[PDB]
Amino acid sequence: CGRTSCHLPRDVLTRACAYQDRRGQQRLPEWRDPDKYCPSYNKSPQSNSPVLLSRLHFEKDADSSERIIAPMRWGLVPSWFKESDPSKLQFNTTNCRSDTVMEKRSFKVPLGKGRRCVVLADGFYEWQRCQGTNQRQPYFIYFPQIKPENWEKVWDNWRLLTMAGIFDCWEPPEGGDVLYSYTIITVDSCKGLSDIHHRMPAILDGEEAVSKWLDFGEVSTQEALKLIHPTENITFHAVSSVVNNSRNNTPECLAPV
DNA sequence: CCAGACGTT
DNA sequence: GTCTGG
DNA sequence: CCAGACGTT
DNA sequence: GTCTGG
């Protein structure tokens, strides 16, 4: 999973991230760096997407079940990385295989420090490789949804896709803001998706999964990794090739055909 | 020991 | 920074 | 992820 | 074929 849609206006996104802390207080997650939120139908690696993380990553003594929402760089840049510019990274951290995560230098260390985040999207795109043709068929893939008038109604009630991520913090040698960057954990595609692609993102389905993944305060790596697996609770439709070029940011990207 | 990699679809 | 391969 | 470049005097 | 930029 190397492309998402995350196009909602910031306040609509934030309201769609309404949740309950461990005490059952209804809350909206508190923003950091909201100016870096860049809505688009076509989010590629190296772009910023909003992710949820525990408040306790940002505030001493916080309730770890409280949530921050913050734009992060898609493509995990490890703390130790030595060059001036993130883009010089010579290995792909767009994704992080679940099967090998504990053996991977770039992911184990930040995972170990509790740096679990939830990557938000409308949904993700996958390109289907079909036998004996180089033509790839793009699909938009998303949580099942409630079953220009309809458009506004749909998107107000949209259930955002919640993907399990890991993030790391990098101080540019040259100097600047700390870079927060993320990888989306991958697992085997479910039966529903297996004729489209062998890989899918690790989807956290519902508030229990999202909560336990976020809460590095109360939930160990070993307990968190149990949430990482495929889900059949997923739907999709084929979309035009408009999505293919990551410069194309329009509704046509995720329109059915 | 040091050198060199650190990753995925 | 930390681990693997030599 | 795909698209597009891939080079020097 | 392989890497960078989006």
DSSP code per residue over A141-203 = EE------HHHHHHHHS---EEEEEEEEEE--TT--SPEEEEEEEEEE--TTTTTT-SEEE-B
Greatest C-alpha distance within chain A = 58
Distance B7 C1' – A160 CA (angstroms): 28
CATH number of the domain within which A210 lies: 3.90.1680.10
- Residues of A with catalytic annotation? 1, 126
Compute, in degrees rounded to 10, the torsion defined by CA atoms A34, A9, A147, A255.
-120
The experimental method behind these coordinates is X-ray
User: Hunting for tokens 């927060």 — which residue is that?
Assistant: A180
Check whether residue A233 has its CB closer than 7 Å to nucleic acid strand B. no
Backbone angles phi, psi at A9, to 5 degrees: -55, 145
Check the CA dihedral A248-A250-A256-A257 and report its sign. Answer: negative
Determine the distance from the C-alpha atom of residue A210 to the mean position of all C-alpha atoms in its chain, rounded to a whole number. 12
Find all residues with CB under 8 Å of A134, minimum gap 6, and list them: none
User: Which nucleotides of chain C are near protein (any atom < 7 Å from a CB)?
Assistant: 1-4
How many domains are there within chain A?
A: 1
Check whether residue A80 has its CB closer than 7 Å to nucleic acid strand B. yes
Decide: A65 and A22 in contact? Cβ < 8 Å.
yes
DSSP code per residue over chain A = ---EEE-S-HHHHHHHT-EE-TT--EEPPEESSGGG---EEEE-TTSEEEEEEEGGGTSTT--TTSEEEEEEEES---TT--SSSGGG--S--SEEESTTGGG-HHHHHHHHTT-EEEEEESEEEEEEE-TT---EEEEEEE------HHHHHHHHS---EEEEEEEEEE--TT--SPEEEEEEEEEE--TTTTTT-SEEE-B--SHHHHHHHH-TTTS-HHHHHTT-S--S--EEEEB-GGGGSTT--SGGGT-B-
Decide: A204 and A211 in contact? Cβ < 8 Å.
no
Backbone angles phi, psi at A203, to 5 degrees: -95, 125
User: Which nucleotides of chain B are near protein (any atom < 7 Å from a CB)?
Assistant: 5-9
Domain extent at residue A161: 1-257
CA distance A152 to A86: 38
Structure tokens at A94: 């767009």
Q: Please give the resolution of this entry in Å, rounded to 1 decimal.
A: 2.1
Structure tokens at A243: 């999505």
